[PDB]
Design an enzyme around this catalytic site. Sequence first.
Site, short mmCIF file in Angstrom:
data_model
loop_
_atom_site.label_atom_id
_atom_site.label_comp_id
_atom_site.label_asym_id
_atom_site.label_seq_id
_atom_site.Cartn_x
_atom_site.Cartn_y
_atom_site.Cartn_z
N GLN A 53 4.29 4.79 -2.36
CA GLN A 53 2.92 4.41 -2.03
C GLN A 53 2.21 3.66 -3.15
OE1 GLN A 53 1.79 8.45 -0.34
NE2 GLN A 53 0.56 7.04 0.91
N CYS A 101 -3.11 8.70 6.41
CA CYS A 101 -2.25 8.32 5.31
C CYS A 101 -3.01 7.39 4.40
CB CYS A 101 -1.01 7.62 5.84
SG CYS A 101 0.07 6.96 4.54
N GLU A 144 5.14 13.40 3.48
CA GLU A 144 5.44 12.85 2.17
C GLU A 144 6.86 12.38 2.01
OE1 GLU A 144 3.15 12.03 0.30
OE2 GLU A 144 1.69 13.04 1.58
N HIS A 147 7.92 9.09 3.54
CA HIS A 147 7.62 7.95 2.69
C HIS A 147 8.84 7.54 1.87
CE1 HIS A 147 3.39 7.04 3.14
NE2 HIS A 147 3.01 8.30 3.00
#
Lengths: 177, 177
Positions: A53, A101, A144, A147
Amino acid sequence: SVRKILRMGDPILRKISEPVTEDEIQTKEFKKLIRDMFDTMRHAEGVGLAAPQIGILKQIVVVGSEDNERYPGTPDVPERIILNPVITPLTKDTSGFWEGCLSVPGMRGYVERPNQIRMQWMDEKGNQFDETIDGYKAIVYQHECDHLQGILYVDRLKDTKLFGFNETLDSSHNVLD
Amino acid sequence: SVRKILRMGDPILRKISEPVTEDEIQTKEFKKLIRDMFDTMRHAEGVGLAAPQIGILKQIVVVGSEDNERYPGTPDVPERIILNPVITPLTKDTSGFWEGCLSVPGMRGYVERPNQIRMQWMDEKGNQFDETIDGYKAIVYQHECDHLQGILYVDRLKDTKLFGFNETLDSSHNVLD
Ligand SMILES: [Zn+2]
Ligand SMILES: [Zn+2]
Protein backbone atom coordinates in the site's frame (compact mmCIF):
# COMPACT_ATOMS: atom_id res chain seq x y z
CA SER A 1 7.44 9.21 8.65
CA VAL A 2 4.08 9.12 6.89
CA ARG A 3 4.35 7.73 3.38
CA LYS A 4 1.97 8.09 0.45
CA ILE A 5 -0.69 5.39 0.32
CA LEU A 6 -1.17 4.09 -3.22
CA ARG A 7 -4.74 4.20 -4.47
CA MET A 8 -6.71 1.60 -6.39
CA GLY A 9 -5.64 1.72 -10.01
CA ASP A 10 -1.93 1.72 -9.18
CA PRO A 11 -0.49 -1.55 -10.62
CA ILE A 12 1.69 -2.08 -7.54
CA LEU A 13 -1.40 -2.84 -5.45
CA ARG A 14 -2.00 -5.79 -7.76
CA LYS A 15 1.49 -7.32 -7.66
CA ILE A 16 2.62 -10.21 -5.45
CA SER A 17 4.67 -9.29 -2.39
CA GLU A 18 7.85 -11.19 -1.63
CA PRO A 19 8.63 -12.85 1.72
CA VAL A 20 10.77 -11.09 4.29
CA THR A 21 14.10 -12.68 5.14
CA GLU A 22 14.93 -13.03 8.82
CA ASP A 23 18.27 -11.58 7.80
CA GLU A 24 16.55 -8.26 7.18
CA ILE A 25 14.24 -7.81 10.19
CA GLN A 26 17.10 -6.35 12.27
CA THR A 27 18.27 -3.91 9.59
CA LYS A 28 17.53 -0.22 10.12
CA GLU A 29 15.86 -0.10 6.71
CA PHE A 30 13.28 -2.65 7.91
CA LYS A 31 12.85 -0.94 11.26
CA LYS A 32 12.37 2.38 9.45
CA LEU A 33 9.80 0.86 7.08
CA ILE A 34 7.92 -0.57 10.05
CA ARG A 35 7.91 2.79 11.84
CA ASP A 36 6.83 4.49 8.62
CA MET A 37 4.04 1.97 8.14
CA PHE A 38 2.70 2.58 11.65
CA ASP A 39 2.98 6.35 11.22
CA THR A 40 1.13 6.10 7.91
CA MET A 41 -1.52 3.72 9.27
CA ARG A 42 -2.18 5.87 12.34
CA HIS A 43 -2.12 9.15 10.44
CA ALA A 44 -4.68 7.63 8.09
CA GLU A 45 -6.72 6.29 11.03
CA GLY A 46 -6.47 2.76 9.70
CA VAL A 47 -6.55 -0.53 11.59
CA GLY A 48 -4.11 -2.15 9.21
CA LEU A 49 -1.61 -1.43 6.46
CA ALA A 50 0.30 -3.69 4.09
CA ALA A 51 3.68 -2.73 2.64
CA PRO A 52 2.44 -2.75 -0.95
CA GLN A 53 0.00 0.00 0.00
CA ILE A 54 2.98 2.31 0.36
CA GLY A 55 4.78 0.82 -2.62
CA ILE A 56 6.86 -1.90 -0.97
CA LEU A 57 6.22 -5.38 -2.32
CA LYS A 58 7.19 -7.27 0.82
CA GLN A 59 5.01 -9.53 2.94
CA ILE A 60 4.80 -6.99 5.75
CA VAL A 61 1.61 -6.07 7.56
CA VAL A 62 1.07 -3.81 10.55
CA VAL A 63 -2.24 -3.77 12.38
CA GLY A 64 -3.57 -2.07 15.44
CA SER A 65 -6.49 -0.07 16.68
CA GLU A 66 -6.04 2.23 19.66
CA ASP A 67 -8.35 2.39 22.69
CA ASN A 68 -11.04 0.03 21.36
CA GLU A 69 -10.76 -2.61 24.10
CA ARG A 70 -13.14 -0.74 26.41
CA TYR A 71 -15.13 0.96 23.64
CA PRO A 72 -18.50 -0.80 23.11
CA GLY A 73 -19.37 -1.77 19.55
CA THR A 74 -15.89 -1.16 18.17
CA PRO A 75 -13.68 -4.29 18.05
CA ASP A 76 -10.04 -3.80 18.96
CA VAL A 77 -6.96 -5.17 17.26
CA PRO A 78 -3.78 -5.39 19.30
CA GLU A 79 -0.90 -3.62 17.60
CA ARG A 80 1.53 -5.93 15.87
CA ILE A 81 3.77 -6.68 12.92
CA ILE A 82 2.72 -9.57 10.70
CA LEU A 83 5.30 -10.92 8.26
CA ASN A 84 5.04 -13.62 5.59
CA PRO A 85 1.49 -14.40 6.69
CA VAL A 86 -0.28 -17.46 5.33
CA ILE A 87 -4.01 -17.82 5.90
CA THR A 88 -6.15 -20.93 5.58
CA PRO A 89 -9.89 -20.68 6.21
CA LEU A 90 -11.11 -23.08 8.89
CA THR A 91 -14.77 -22.54 8.08
CA LYS A 92 -17.24 -21.84 5.29
CA ASP A 93 -19.10 -19.64 7.77
CA THR A 94 -18.74 -15.96 7.09
CA SER A 95 -19.49 -12.67 8.76
CA GLY A 96 -20.41 -9.83 6.47
CA PHE A 97 -18.74 -6.50 7.01
CA TRP A 98 -18.78 -3.16 5.25
CA GLU A 99 -15.08 -2.95 4.56
CA GLY A 100 -13.09 0.07 3.52
CA CYS A 101 -9.49 0.35 2.37
CA LEU A 102 -6.91 3.10 2.65
CA SER A 103 -6.14 2.40 -1.00
CA VAL A 104 -9.83 2.83 -1.93
CA PRO A 105 -10.55 6.18 -0.24
CA GLY A 106 -14.11 7.38 0.26
CA MET A 107 -15.80 4.05 -0.31
CA ARG A 108 -16.81 0.80 1.27
CA GLY A 109 -18.30 -2.49 0.27
CA TYR A 110 -19.91 -5.50 1.81
CA VAL A 111 -17.53 -8.43 2.03
CA GLU A 112 -18.12 -11.85 3.54
CA ARG A 113 -14.95 -13.64 4.58
CA PRO A 114 -14.52 -16.87 6.56
CA ASN A 115 -14.94 -15.87 10.20
CA GLN A 116 -12.41 -18.45 11.39
CA ILE A 117 -8.95 -18.81 9.91
CA ARG A 118 -5.54 -20.30 10.59
CA MET A 119 -2.71 -17.84 10.22
CA GLN A 120 0.98 -18.61 10.23
CA TRP A 121 3.39 -15.73 10.42
CA MET A 122 6.54 -14.24 11.87
CA ASP A 123 6.81 -11.03 13.88
CA GLU A 124 9.68 -8.52 13.85
CA LYS A 125 11.46 -10.54 16.54
CA GLY A 126 11.62 -13.60 14.32
CA ASN A 127 8.96 -15.31 16.41
CA GLN A 128 6.85 -17.84 14.51
CA PHE A 129 3.12 -18.06 15.11
CA ASP A 130 0.45 -20.51 14.04
CA GLU A 131 -2.87 -19.48 15.55
CA THR A 132 -6.59 -19.75 14.96
CA ILE A 133 -7.94 -16.24 14.40
CA ASP A 134 -11.62 -15.34 14.39
CA GLY A 135 -14.08 -12.48 14.44
CA TYR A 136 -12.93 -9.00 13.51
CA LYS A 137 -9.21 -9.76 13.58
CA ALA A 138 -9.88 -12.57 11.13
CA ILE A 139 -11.43 -10.06 8.72
CA VAL A 140 -8.65 -7.52 9.18
CA TYR A 141 -5.94 -10.14 8.71
CA GLN A 142 -7.48 -11.56 5.56
CA HIS A 143 -8.00 -8.04 4.22
CA GLU A 144 -4.38 -7.18 4.94
CA CYS A 145 -2.90 -10.40 3.63
CA ASP A 146 -4.96 -10.07 0.44
CA HIS A 147 -2.85 -6.98 -0.23
CA LEU A 148 0.24 -9.18 -0.23
CA GLN A 149 -1.37 -11.21 -3.03
CA GLY A 150 -2.30 -8.07 -4.95
CA ILE A 151 -5.92 -8.39 -3.89
CA LEU A 152 -8.21 -5.56 -2.79
CA TYR A 153 -11.59 -6.01 -1.11
CA VAL A 154 -13.34 -4.79 -4.25
CA ASP A 155 -12.20 -8.10 -5.73
CA ARG A 156 -14.28 -9.84 -3.07
CA LEU A 157 -17.44 -7.74 -2.95
CA LYS A 158 -20.45 -9.88 -2.13
CA ASP A 159 -22.35 -7.80 -4.66
CA THR A 160 -21.46 -4.66 -6.58
CA LYS A 161 -24.82 -3.26 -5.49
CA LEU A 162 -23.50 -3.30 -1.89
CA PHE A 163 -20.71 -0.88 -2.67
CA GLY A 164 -20.53 2.90 -2.86
CA PHE A 165 -19.29 6.15 -1.43
CA ASN A 166 -19.26 6.60 2.30
CA GLU A 167 -21.21 9.84 2.39
CA THR A 168 -23.76 8.54 -0.11
CA LEU A 169 -24.12 5.24 1.76
CA ASP A 170 -24.38 7.12 5.08
CA SER A 171 -27.09 9.52 3.91
CA SER A 172 -29.11 6.80 2.18
CA HIS A 173 -29.13 4.33 5.06
CA ASN A 174 -29.71 6.23 8.27
CA VAL A 175 -29.81 4.96 11.84
CA LEU A 176 -30.20 6.49 15.31
CA ASP A 177 -26.73 7.97 14.87
CA SER B 1 -30.84 23.95 -14.36
CA VAL B 2 -28.04 21.70 -13.14
CA ARG B 3 -29.36 18.98 -10.85
CA LYS B 4 -27.50 16.86 -8.33
CA ILE B 5 -26.08 13.65 -9.79
CA LEU B 6 -26.67 10.70 -7.48
CA ARG B 7 -23.55 8.73 -6.63
CA MET B 8 -23.03 4.99 -6.44
CA GLY B 9 -24.50 3.73 -3.20
CA ASP B 10 -27.79 5.60 -3.66
CA PRO B 11 -30.56 2.97 -3.99
CA ILE B 12 -32.27 4.93 -6.77
CA LEU B 13 -29.41 4.14 -9.14
CA ARG B 14 -30.33 0.48 -8.76
CA LYS B 15 -34.09 0.77 -9.39
CA ILE B 16 -35.88 0.11 -12.67
CA SER B 17 -36.92 3.16 -14.67
CA GLU B 18 -40.44 3.32 -16.09
CA PRO B 19 -41.26 4.04 -19.75
CA VAL B 20 -42.23 7.53 -20.89
CA THR B 21 -45.52 8.00 -22.78
CA GLU B 22 -45.93 9.75 -26.13
CA ASP B 23 -48.19 12.34 -24.51
CA GLU B 24 -45.64 12.79 -21.74
CA ILE B 25 -42.89 13.93 -24.11
CA GLN B 26 -45.03 16.97 -24.94
CA THR B 27 -45.51 18.10 -21.34
CA LYS B 28 -43.65 21.12 -19.98
CA GLU B 29 -42.54 18.93 -17.05
CA PHE B 30 -40.77 16.58 -19.48
CA LYS B 31 -39.11 19.42 -21.35
CA LYS B 32 -37.93 21.00 -18.10
CA LEU B 33 -36.44 17.65 -17.17
CA ILE B 34 -34.78 17.29 -20.56
CA ARG B 35 -33.25 20.75 -20.36
CA ASP B 36 -32.13 20.02 -16.80
CA MET B 37 -30.59 16.74 -17.86
CA PHE B 38 -28.58 18.42 -20.63
CA ASP B 39 -27.52 21.25 -18.33
CA THR B 40 -26.41 18.68 -15.76
CA MET B 41 -24.67 16.46 -18.30
CA ARG B 42 -22.82 19.40 -19.87
CA HIS B 43 -21.89 21.02 -16.58
CA ALA B 44 -20.47 17.65 -15.50
CA GLU B 45 -18.67 17.24 -18.83
CA GLY B 46 -20.43 13.94 -19.45
CA VAL B 47 -21.25 12.25 -22.76
CA GLY B 48 -24.48 10.84 -21.42
CA LEU B 49 -26.93 11.04 -18.54
CA ALA B 50 -29.88 8.88 -17.55
CA ALA B 51 -32.86 10.26 -15.62
CA PRO B 52 -32.30 7.96 -12.64
CA GLN B 53 -28.88 9.58 -12.18
CA ILE B 54 -30.68 12.74 -11.11
CA GLY B 55 -33.35 10.82 -9.23
CA ILE B 56 -36.02 10.39 -11.89
CA LEU B 57 -36.92 6.76 -12.58
CA LYS B 58 -38.03 7.27 -16.18
CA GLN B 59 -36.56 5.71 -19.31
CA ILE B 60 -34.98 8.98 -20.39
CA VAL B 61 -31.44 9.29 -21.68
CA VAL B 62 -29.62 12.30 -23.10
CA VAL B 63 -26.29 11.92 -24.85
CA GLY B 64 -23.87 14.17 -26.66
CA SER B 65 -20.24 15.23 -26.33
CA GLU B 66 -18.11 17.88 -27.99
CA ASP B 67 -14.34 17.59 -27.47
CA ASN B 68 -15.00 15.77 -24.20
CA GLU B 69 -12.34 16.27 -21.54
CA ARG B 70 -13.37 13.27 -19.44
CA TYR B 71 -12.73 10.88 -22.37
CA PRO B 72 -10.00 12.64 -24.46
CA GLY B 73 -9.58 9.98 -27.15
CA THR B 74 -13.23 9.41 -28.03
CA PRO B 75 -15.20 10.73 -31.05
CA ASP B 76 -17.81 13.45 -30.59
CA VAL B 77 -21.36 12.29 -30.08
CA PRO B 78 -24.15 14.52 -31.39
CA GLU B 79 -26.65 15.42 -28.67
CA ARG B 80 -29.96 13.57 -28.94
CA ILE B 81 -32.76 12.41 -26.66
CA ILE B 82 -33.24 8.66 -26.28
CA LEU B 83 -36.48 7.47 -24.72
CA ASN B 84 -37.68 3.97 -23.82
CA PRO B 85 -34.56 2.47 -25.39
CA VAL B 86 -34.32 -1.27 -25.90
CA ILE B 87 -30.96 -2.78 -26.80
CA THR B 88 -30.24 -6.20 -28.27
CA PRO B 89 -26.64 -7.23 -28.90
CA LEU B 90 -26.01 -8.23 -32.50
CA THR B 91 -22.59 -9.71 -31.76
CA LYS B 92 -20.50 -11.50 -29.15
CA ASP B 93 -17.58 -9.35 -30.29
CA THR B 94 -16.63 -6.67 -27.82
CA SER B 95 -14.44 -3.62 -27.63
CA GLY B 96 -12.90 -2.91 -24.28
CA PHE B 97 -13.09 0.60 -22.92
CA TRP B 98 -12.05 2.31 -19.71
CA GLU B 99 -15.47 3.61 -18.81
CA GLY B 100 -16.33 6.24 -16.26
CA CYS B 101 -19.68 7.35 -14.88
CA LEU B 102 -20.96 10.66 -13.57
CA SER B 103 -22.47 8.63 -10.75
CA VAL B 104 -19.09 7.03 -9.97
CA PRO B 105 -16.93 10.19 -9.77
CA GLY B 106 -13.15 9.93 -9.85
CA MET B 107 -12.96 6.39 -11.14
CA ARG B 108 -12.59 4.36 -14.34
CA GLY B 109 -13.02 0.68 -15.06
CA TYR B 110 -12.37 -1.55 -18.04
CA VAL B 111 -15.62 -2.77 -19.55
CA GLU B 112 -16.13 -4.93 -22.62
CA ARG B 113 -19.53 -4.54 -24.24
CA PRO B 114 -20.81 -5.90 -27.56
CA ASN B 115 -19.49 -3.50 -30.21
CA GLN B 116 -22.58 -3.91 -32.37
CA ILE B 117 -26.11 -3.55 -31.07
CA ARG B 118 -29.67 -3.01 -32.20
CA MET B 119 -31.41 -0.17 -30.43
CA GLN B 120 -35.08 0.70 -30.58
CA TRP B 121 -36.18 3.98 -29.10
CA MET B 122 -38.27 7.11 -29.37
CA ASP B 123 -37.05 10.70 -29.42
CA GLU B 124 -38.77 13.75 -27.93
CA LYS B 125 -40.73 14.21 -31.15
CA GLY B 126 -42.34 10.80 -30.80
CA ASN B 127 -40.25 9.46 -33.66
CA GLN B 128 -39.52 5.74 -33.45
CA PHE B 129 -36.08 4.40 -34.32
CA ASP B 130 -34.70 0.92 -34.85
CA GLU B 131 -31.06 1.16 -35.82
CA THR B 132 -27.84 -0.80 -35.71
CA ILE B 133 -25.39 1.07 -33.51
CA ASP B 134 -21.69 0.33 -33.26
CA GLY B 135 -18.37 1.62 -32.03
CA TYR B 136 -18.29 4.30 -29.36
CA LYS B 137 -21.97 5.22 -29.53
CA ALA B 138 -22.74 1.56 -28.93
CA ILE B 139 -20.76 1.71 -25.69
CA VAL B 140 -22.32 4.98 -24.57
CA TYR B 141 -25.84 3.80 -25.38
CA GLN B 142 -25.43 0.52 -23.52
CA HIS B 143 -23.87 2.35 -20.59
CA GLU B 144 -26.76 4.79 -20.50
CA CYS B 145 -29.50 2.20 -20.96
CA ASP B 146 -27.96 0.10 -18.19
CA HIS B 147 -28.84 2.99 -15.90
CA LEU B 148 -32.49 2.53 -16.82
CA GLN B 149 -32.20 -1.06 -15.58
CA GLY B 150 -30.48 0.01 -12.38
CA ILE B 151 -27.11 -1.14 -13.67
CA LEU B 152 -23.80 0.70 -13.31
CA TYR B 153 -20.63 -0.15 -15.23
CA VAL B 154 -19.03 -1.41 -12.03
CA ASP B 155 -21.52 -4.27 -12.37
CA ARG B 156 -19.87 -5.10 -15.70
CA LEU B 157 -16.17 -4.67 -14.93
CA LYS B 158 -14.10 -7.13 -16.94
CA ASP B 159 -11.95 -7.52 -13.85
CA THR B 160 -11.90 -5.64 -10.56
CA LYS B 161 -8.13 -5.37 -10.98
CA LEU B 162 -8.81 -3.10 -13.97
CA PHE B 163 -10.60 -0.50 -11.91
CA GLY B 164 -9.34 2.40 -9.82
CA PHE B 165 -9.10 6.13 -9.33
CA ASN B 166 -8.56 8.33 -12.43
CA GLU B 167 -5.63 10.30 -11.05
CA THR B 168 -3.64 7.11 -10.59
CA LEU B 169 -5.06 5.48 -13.72
CA ASP B 170 -3.86 8.46 -15.75
CA SER B 171 -0.38 8.28 -14.20
CA SER B 172 0.11 4.54 -14.30
CA HIS B 173 -0.38 1.82 -16.88
CA ASN B 174 -2.22 -1.42 -16.19
CA VAL B 175 -1.36 -4.04 -18.79
CA LEU B 176 -4.46 -5.51 -20.43
CA ASP B 177 -4.26 -9.18 -21.42
ZN1 LIG C 1 -6.52 -2.22 2.75
ZN1 LIG D 1 -23.16 6.46 -16.16
